From Swiss-Prot, chain A:
Domain notes: Forms the trimeric core subcomplex IFT122:IFT140:WDR19 via the C-terminal region, whereas it interacts with IFT43:WDR35 via the N-terminal region containing the WD repeats.
Subunit note: Component of the IFT complex A (IFT-A) complex. IFT-A complex is divided into a core subcomplex composed of IFT122:IFT140:WDR19 which is associated with TULP3 and a peripheral subcomplex composed of IFT43:WDR35:TTC21B. Interacts with IFT43:WDR35; the interaction connects the 2 IFT-A subcomplexes. Interacts with IFTAP; the interaction associates IFTAP with IFT-A complex.
WD repeat placement: 29-68, 70-110
Residues of the full protein shown: 250 to 373 of 1241
Membrane spanning residue stretches: none
Disease tied to this entry: Cranioectodermal dysplasia 1: A disorder characterized by craniofacial, skeletal and ectodermal abnormalities. Clinical features include dolichocephaly (with or without sagittal suture synostosis), scaphocephaly, short stature, limb shortening, short ribs, narrow chest, brachydactyly, renal failure and hepatic fibrosis, small and abnormally shaped teeth, sparse hair, skin laxity and abnormal nails.
Protein name in the entry: Intraflagellar transport protein 122 homolog
Tissue/organ expression: Expressed in many tissues. Predominant expression in testis and pituitary.
Reported function: As a component of the IFT complex A (IFT-A), a complex required for retrograde ciliary transport and entry into cilia of G protein-coupled receptors (GPCRs), it is required in ciliogenesis and ciliary protein trafficking. Involved in cilia formation during neuronal patterning. Acts as a negative regulator of Shh signaling. Required to recruit TULP3 to primary cilia.
From Swiss-Prot, chain B:
Protein name: Tetratricopeptide repeat protein 21B
Domain of life the protein comes from: Eukaryota
Residue stretches of each TPR repeat: 27-60, 62-94, 96-129
Localisation: Cytoplasm, Cytoskeleton, Cilium axoneme
Disulfide bonds: none
Organism (species): Homo sapiens
Associated clinical condition: Ciliary dysfunction leads to a broad spectrum of disorders, collectively termed ciliopathies. Overlapping clinical features include retinal degeneration, renal cystic disease, skeletal abnormalities, fibrosis of various organ, and a complex range of anatomical and functional defects of the central and peripheral nervous system. The ciliopathy range of diseases includes Meckel-Gruber syndrome, Bardet-Biedl syndrome, Joubert syndrome, nephronophtisis, Senior-Loken syndrome, and Jeune asphyxiating thoracic dystrophy among others. TTC21B is causally associated with diverse ciliopathies.
Family of this protein: Belongs to the TTC21 family.
Taxonomy of the source species: Eukaryota, Metazoa, Chordata, Craniata, Vertebrata
Record text on subunit structure and interactions: Component of the IFT complex A (IFT-A) complex. IFT-A complex is divided into a core subcomplex composed of IFT122:IFT140:WDR19 which is associated with TULP3 and a peripheral subcomplex composed of IFT43:WDR35:TTC21B. Interacts directy with WDR35 and TTC21B. Interacts with TTC25.
The protein's role, per its UniProt record: Component of the IFT complex A (IFT-A), a complex required for retrograde ciliary transport and entry into cilia of G protein-coupled receptors (GPCRs). Essential for retrograde trafficking of IFT-1, IFT-B and GPCRs. Negatively modulates the SHH signal transduction.
Length: 124, 145
């Protein structure tokens, strides 16, 4: 079985474990206590919030991609809309924020060749 | 250790009024007199002098720390937390003990997340500072739900 469990510890790390108990890769050191780990619709990106008063987007491997929102308290939950780029962030202050994530097209073209950005970390 | 002589001398000093040239000497004198009073358990007049010093200067870290200790003695956890937070901010978080007291006061006031934040700040400042992982951070973590 090829299943991945993303784990957000309070030792400030995120791990990825297989169903057999073996780990996938190394840990990803964090400088904040995580309180919410989730996924997008097709499981392509990861949402991470917590002790940092902000929400971050990560690759499915755990490489940080950018900041979704900057909040004023701990983000206790960082879910995402079931079939869209919208994300909703609820924090301890009681604030609920509904962001729409927009991804910029990064590409170049020369005559008969066209390079573009795929999966936010690859060049096709 | 000529403490009574110092107490009488500072009683005399506090009688004179503050001036624009010896402000720091005045603040040191008032702080030492507050020290003597707190040692002698004269909380009221020490509080009065500390309020005086804070009136004449709004960023005296030691005065705020003394006020936090006084409010702790009366279990004024909200006021003690505010004073300790102010002292922690103005000291540029170079005194781990102040952070310890402040996190403890948040913990007692049932403000667990702020206590955890201050504990993280202290441990980042000093990873080896003991008695904070268990006496404060662990207890705050256990009380979240």
């Amino acid at each position: 079985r090829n299943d991945i469990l993303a784990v957000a510890d309070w030792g400030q790390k995120v791990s990825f474990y297989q169903l057999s108990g073996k780990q996938i890769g190394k840990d990803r050191a964090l400088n904040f206590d995580p309180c919410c780990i989730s996924y997008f619709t097709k499981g392509e990106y990861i949402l991470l919030g917590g002790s940092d008063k902000q929400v971050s987007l990560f690759t499915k491997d755990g490489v940080r991609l950018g900041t979704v929102g900057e909040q004023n308290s701990w983000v206790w939950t960082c879910q995402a809309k079931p079939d869209s780029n919208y994300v909703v962030v609820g924090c301890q202050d009681g604030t609920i924020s509904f962001y729409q994530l927009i991804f910029s097209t990064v590409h170049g073209l020369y005559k008969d060749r066209y390079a573009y950005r795929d999966s936010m970390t690859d060049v096709i | 250790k000529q403490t009574p002589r110092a107490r009488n001398q500072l009683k005399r000093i506090a009688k004179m009024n503050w001036n624009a040239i010896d402000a720091e000497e005045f603040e040191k004198s008032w702080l030492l007199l507050a020290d003597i009073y707190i040692q002698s358990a004269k909380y009221d007049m020490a509080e009065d002098l500390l309020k005086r010093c804070l009136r004449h200067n709004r960023s005296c870290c030691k005065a705020y720390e003394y006020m936090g200790y006084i409010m702790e003695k009366e279990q004024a956890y909200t006021d003690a937390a505010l004073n300790y937070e102010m002292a922690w901010k103005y000291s540029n978080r170079t005194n781990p003990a102040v952070g310890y007291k402040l996190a403890f006061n948040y913990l007692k006031a049932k403000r667990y997340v702020d206590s955890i934040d201050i504990c993280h700040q202290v441990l980042e400042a000093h990873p080896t500072y003991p008695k904070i992982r268990k006496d404060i951070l662990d207890k705050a973590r256990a009380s979240l739900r």
